[model samples]
Target: PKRLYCKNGGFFLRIHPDGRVDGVREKSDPHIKLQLQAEERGVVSIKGVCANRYLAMKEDGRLLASKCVTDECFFFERLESNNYNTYRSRKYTSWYVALKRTGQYKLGSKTGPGQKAILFLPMS
Candidate 1:
């Protein structure tokens, strides 16, 4: 388990009780705590430590906090050349879990491997 910290805006990825998946700038935010499970080689599942929900990808890269671990919850975790990690949706290969400049989630459809928003540093 770790915090998916986006260095772009010093944002920490969060999953809330209302099933919203977003990012927060404060490292002390409780929702920043996440449980990451290795499903296969590069495949993983992300869940909120406190929210008890799985991170999911919906149509058009819409993020969701789901109640079950399904195909939509799987992500391909990749380490880029810059030493940061990128989580690409298994259901939508081209879409990455990205965040905006202001610590908000960037739709996966608008994301890319080279974008700063797609880069995350897994923090303890």
Candidate 2:
């Protein structure tokens, strides 16, 4: 398991027990620990160890914590070129999970390498 840190912003993605997702700079925070589960094909699921929830995208294009494993929790693609991964929403093909500068999560519709919000660095 590795911590997923935001490239544009120096913060680690964390999911709270109340089902809130945010970016934090504290590595000691238990919520910052994430478990990446590799599913069928090449898709993966990002799970929060402390919260025991999966990172998922809502139908309204918002990012949140989910307890159950669903299509929306699956990340279909991982691009290694940018040294990061792209998490595409299963329910919405066009939407990608992204982290804002304010440490908030949102769904981005753009599909390109320049989208730094959707790109995350895997920290050891």
lDDT of 1 by residue, 40-86 (tens): 99999999998999999887789889898889999999888889999
Model 1 earns a TM-score of 0.96
TM-score of each: 0.96, 0.88
- List model 2 lDDT by residue over 18-85, tens digit each: 78998888899999898988886778888988899998877777788888988778877677685677
lDDT score of residue 109 within candidate 2: 53
Stretches > 4 Å off in candidate 1:
none
Error at 9, model 1, angstroms: 0.9
Question: After TM-score superposition, what is the CA distance of residue 91 in candidate 1 from its true location, in Å?
Answer: 0.9
Worst 10 residues of 2 by lDDT: 105-114
Tell me each candidate's RMSD, in Å, in order. Answer: 0.9, 1.8
* Residue 20 displacement in candidate 2 (angstroms): 0.5
